[PDB]
Amino acid sequence: KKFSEVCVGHLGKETDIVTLPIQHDSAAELAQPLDVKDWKKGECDLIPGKTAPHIMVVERDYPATYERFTSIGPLMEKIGNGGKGIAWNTQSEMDLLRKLNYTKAEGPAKGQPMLNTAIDAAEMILTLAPETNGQVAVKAWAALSEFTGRDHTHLALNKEDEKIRFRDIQAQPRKIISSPTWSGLEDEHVSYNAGYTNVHELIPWRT
Amino acid sequence: KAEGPAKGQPMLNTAIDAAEMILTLAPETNGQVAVKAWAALSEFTGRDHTHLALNKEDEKIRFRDIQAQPRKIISSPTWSGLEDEHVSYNAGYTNVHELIPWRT
Amino acid sequence: MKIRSQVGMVLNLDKAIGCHTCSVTCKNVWTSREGVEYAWFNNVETKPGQGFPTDWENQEKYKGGWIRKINGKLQPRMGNRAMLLGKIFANPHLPGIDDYYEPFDFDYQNLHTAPEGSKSQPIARPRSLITGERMAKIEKGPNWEDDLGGEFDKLAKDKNFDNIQKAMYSQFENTFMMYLPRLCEHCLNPACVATCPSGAIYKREEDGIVLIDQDKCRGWRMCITGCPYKKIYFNWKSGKSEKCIFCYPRIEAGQPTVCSETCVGRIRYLGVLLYDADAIERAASTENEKDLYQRQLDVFLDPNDPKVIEQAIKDGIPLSVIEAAQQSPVYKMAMEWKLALPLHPEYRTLPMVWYVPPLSPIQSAADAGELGSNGILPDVESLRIPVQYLANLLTAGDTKPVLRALKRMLAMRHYKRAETVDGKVDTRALEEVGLTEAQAQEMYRYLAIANYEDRFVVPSSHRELAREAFPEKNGCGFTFGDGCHGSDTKFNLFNSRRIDAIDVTSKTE
Amino acid sequence: MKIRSQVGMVLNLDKAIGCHTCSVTCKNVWTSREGVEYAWFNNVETKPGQGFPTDWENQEKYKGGWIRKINGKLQPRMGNRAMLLGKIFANPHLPGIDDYYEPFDFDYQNLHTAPEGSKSQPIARPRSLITGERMAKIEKGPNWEDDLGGEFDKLAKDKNFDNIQKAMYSQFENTFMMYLPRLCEHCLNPACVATCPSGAIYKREEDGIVLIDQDKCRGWRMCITGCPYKKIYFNWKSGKSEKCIFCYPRIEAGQPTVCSETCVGRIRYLGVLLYDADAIERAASTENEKDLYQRQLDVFLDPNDPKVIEQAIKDGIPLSVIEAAQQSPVYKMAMEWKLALPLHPEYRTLPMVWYVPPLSPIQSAADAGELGSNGILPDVESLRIPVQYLANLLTAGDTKPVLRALKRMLAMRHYKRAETVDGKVDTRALEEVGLTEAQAQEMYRYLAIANYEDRFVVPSSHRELAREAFPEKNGCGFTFGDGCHGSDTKFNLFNSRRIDAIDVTSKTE
Amino acid sequence: VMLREFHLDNPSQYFTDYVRRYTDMPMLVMLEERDGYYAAGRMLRAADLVAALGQENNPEWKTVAFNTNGEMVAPNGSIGFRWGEKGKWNLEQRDGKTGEETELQLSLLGSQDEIAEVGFPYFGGDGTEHFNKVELENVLLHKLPVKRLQLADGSTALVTTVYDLTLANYGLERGLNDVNCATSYDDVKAYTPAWAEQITGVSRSQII
Amino acid sequence: SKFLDRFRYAKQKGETFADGHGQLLNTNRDWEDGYRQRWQHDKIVRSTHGVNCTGSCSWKIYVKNGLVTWETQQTDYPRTRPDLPNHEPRGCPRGASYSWYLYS
């Protein structure tokens, strides 16, 4: 909040050039297949995202730092959410969050869910994550299924209506939902064991 | 039971044992039973009703868990309303929306 | 300008269901001892009625509250300092046990021990908890008038019917009744504190809770008369007086009072109010009693005003208390929406437990009626409870603020119906009462949905400030009897030392 | 024959992880006051070691427990009544503060207040909680020997190494260590009760918990010497002694003790034991100390025996207590499976907190070894902890009962492995130790799975019996200071009355 | 010891099938020419073969192995199938080109074109004075079964499986009479119980 | 000594306020522990009422001095949709008085 007012006249809507290394679990991980080439040594061309880091452009609205900090941004709805090589649509979760956290009445983030309290932030985490929201869990396993060609949604369908809430865990700790983010199952017949999904669901190790 | 007339059968010694019997057998408190119950009904109506409990098929309410926090029950064919997060429980709802006849 | 804070309370009488749950929980926790069995710190009364104790609102009879002398100075209605002391040998205005009720119990054991061959079925008869003697009949109780129990001519003696032609209300078709739950108002200008000769009653600086020091009270029993709400009850056994303690043990850690958290109707709200203590006397001594309500609002300070915030910090108000004040449901209802009103502001005590007046079924008419400004919903003019009665109860007879509160509640209803039934935006009713869509939606959030976190916004009383919480955490509760508690001087005749203190001083500075 | 009940405790040393969680929780709740900061009602010691206080097991030095005179009569090792009184002006055997450790704190504030321009980085140095003076160095603590902290020759002074050629254990390859958590044993024949001149120490009839009356204790400090487990700690500030109270406030309503419910290793079990109080002296005075263990088992009564049940009811034992006794994990481990053993039965106090001995890694050998009677799992003869050490600790030097306990634990393991790995029934090991499949499965249920409801089977102490719970429920806790608590006679000099009592007598009988 | 007793001498049905389907052991590694011997180079990729094993997408990111019929194949699951395509990034034992079921072969021993000596780095002889060391050779030459392959660029190359490379690395004698392989657990060789006893101080019998 | 404290009379006087209408005092308040120690309890247990009311309300049963002393409603029911009010605290005057029976 203080930064947002102190930066006025010094920093405004800026354009930032950010380097980003080639990421594991992204198509770019298939960078150099047979050997190592150093572009600075002229052994290859400087190709960002392959023989060098990605060169990204990031727009920053410094005066709006506080308003952005205290609200859930529009990228969740415009781009979506994901991780570990898979992505999914999370519109329904953002709609839920608008009702749970309320929304910005005005300003740069008008209409976006609020992030005023730590609880609002906790609810964001719980609602968006597949481990804590069966709806997301099924969409996540579905995304993975596209890659493997094998159905994995059966791993979360029986808990699709499950939604862990902050106040419920204050009443009693809750067991999470099987998620593609991991490799073991949260099941009532088999304990969580890493590599279990690779061995039993035939999902490859990311090697 | 270790021996006697009921040897091998589950025990009903304490009130908790009895409570667990209720919770485990009922479709309202055991998603596994809920799905089997809706499936049985589906035979009569010719319409699938298992979709009403599939999303909670792994749910199993336990006595000690409800001591920690009261738990909402599962939609069951024993009743005519839904235990849902988008629509409140309203009697006759399944007859009107699932086309299940009133027993008249 | 001296800023202080207090957790005020607002009771929404429109949602009141007169269930008394609040009274039972308080009783179980705080007053189940012999001596105060007849005392109900929290009690609910059905109106019209005379209440508990009987006719407590009749100050000409009970002499409670303050009066504003011709010279403009305030004086307890009981009398000035000398006048009051002259009444100490026998308080002439003191309410008697019969003004409350003679506490009773029943001989349940007779049901168990009745001898064989009894001529009739055994029964459990009433017995007095004061004398232990058989009572021929129970003739009174703390809630005797519940739900219009008693002839109208008796109930209508209700002080609030003053200046009202009440005959019409004795007719069946015009019947009306409402509920008034109440506790101590924990006033800014308490008459009790001012009328105690020993100075045993005080208002806590950090949270404004008013208490009767059980060590220092000498049992002069003058305070009982001083309180115009008759919320101080004499403990006939201990010989000392007791009163609602606003559940300070809970409030101190940020919890709601027992009567607030256990309110079944969900009508009680708890929120901080910051007030200028230096303006208390000026406000309470305003010439016209119909100005007391607004004068008190003027003593309440805007918690979002940086000027107030900085002053608050300078005056020692904790940051978490200021924060709580900024999201206080009580501040919104009393200051912003003007829905909450004080209880009998004319007593001049600047009460801190306020009320939102109740709506009621439309009055009897010639026909079924026509659509009014609010469509099928009621217009304020059609409500059956006479607004003048509510004004006598909450605004010193001025119907203006009561009508505003009621009209705004009805306006919110009109606006929400257009929204939820017609799926349209209709702000006609809101505009008529000076409310914006945003205000109506927030009112709805707090009054209708009323989530737990929105009903109670109680900050910690911060017991660590200006004290030594560490040794206390380690040794409080070991009640072996060190005989050193309650005094600042360390010397004690029994040559002992405090269990929860450190006697070996650090020699390394 | 006089039956009484008590909630005994069993600690499974085989599952002990020596974490001290039990010690910290007890400390936070019961002994964080100045005067007892150095006292650890529950303390954990690593063996081999001398413990807390140092060498507490050396009765020749500390004079704790009982001795059996030539005439067969019991006498406190401290001396008979006259001998003990002759030592009252200065207890010659009393442990000094240094036998425990000098309690310390640190000057943390120096880190906050160090002045600008300090020549070196500020630091928090130790200070004595006894004198408040700077301590040049901390040289002792209540858990100084944790995990073999100290030279072997020092740790090996351990009393339990008596009659053992301990040289071999000073070799790296033969290193061994175990954990011994302990509290007050709440004995059937407590030496503390017998050695207190004021008679301030007593065993509660209804639950056998032993307490030091904080009103009646006169600070004669003889009991401290009397207790052979050194579980009574002098409060140097109050001048009175205190000890583990077996968390009676919790036990009274059926809850586990704090150290039991907070035991991270899940090694503590709580269960009722019914005992014949009339046999206490006979058992404790048996001629051979190696017979004390069995003599005590003989004082424990079979809770499923109708003869005992009917006698129990006649002697006032509540039905819920008898029921709890019938599903007592402590009774199963001590009486049925013979896994639990008393701690130092030779002190002749008939301790009520027992222990299951620990298993250990196999000893050093010439090669990797061969399959034994238990296959790849250990045979009792191969365990590295010398059984004689464990016998000195739990069975007065008799290795027989220790070997039985250890062998049975290993047998259960063999049986379960055949079941879970080979999918076969192999009772060879069980038969060798006299266990049935049913017993092994129940042992497994309680020791391995160990559900909460199986670890703690604590009945209510029934505070309503022979008392008046109603007035107490209504008025307990209002600590205003009526000055009438603690005496049966109603007369009191301050002309007051009990807050939690009824003074107005019923006149209707 | 595990490999010797449960993989070679008395092959475990469970273990064998497991490493066959869940490890890169059956994967082919290209050997690099050195002075007098070979060194294990990079893993063979589908792109290295003429028809790229019918792999159009990410052929340079898909590993290769021989099926039990001596045929070379690009099994599903390799990182190349993760991007640019879908449905084949799984551990089903199938041919990444024909989509037909296949069985990967672990060792080339018994179907090799020749035996080649591959050098393995050994650091067990280095270290400070505070730790025991076992002197052998900085480079240990092992006899590995290989097969010569015709690459897409027209050149030729020798390949062996990760499986064979692993057994050699552990010092397991397989009948090729490898002087650097153990004749028994007591033989001080690069990786035996006898060897480890010297390095760690743990008794060989315990290790065994 | 409370008697000796009386001598710190004027010394415990702080600032006056409201133009002399009030006086701030700096005196002992230890007596307040009297009501604090009444509220304090051993534990709370979750229970409800087996009476035919339809309430089905979960309560916190307070145990103090090893006896049941009073009850207050639980407020931790799973919350209803954001557009609906929640159920807490439920309860009624009858239920609030149940504790009376135990030793009555």
Ligand code: SF4
């Ligand atoms: S309502 Fe409370 S604070 Fe106000 S005068 Fe009465 S007892 Fe005092």
Ligand code: SF4
């Ligand atoms: S605030 Fe507390 S003491 Fe006062 S009436 Fe309510 S429950 Fe009773």
Ligand code: SF4
């Ligand atoms: S262990 Fe406890 S009961 Fe036994 S003698 Fe010591 S203090 Fe007394």
Ligand code: SF4
């Ligand atoms: S029983 Fe209670 S008092 Fe005794 S050691 Fe355990 S926690 Fe401490």
Ligand code: SF4
């Ligand atoms: S509080 Fe009242 S309504 Fe609720 S369960 Fe108890 S008796 Fe029924």
Ligand code: F3S
């Ligand atoms: S007048 Fe004062 S002395 Fe006690 S009885 Fe009232 S608080």
Ligand code: F3S
């Ligand atoms: S009467 Fe009932 S509605 Fe609330 S204010 Fe008392 S609990």
Ligand code: F3S
């Ligand atoms: S001897 Fe007795 S007098 Fe107190 S110090 Fe020990 S309990």
Ligand code: F3S
């Ligand atoms: S040492 Fe740890 S294992 Fe239990 S007995 Fe104490 S909490």
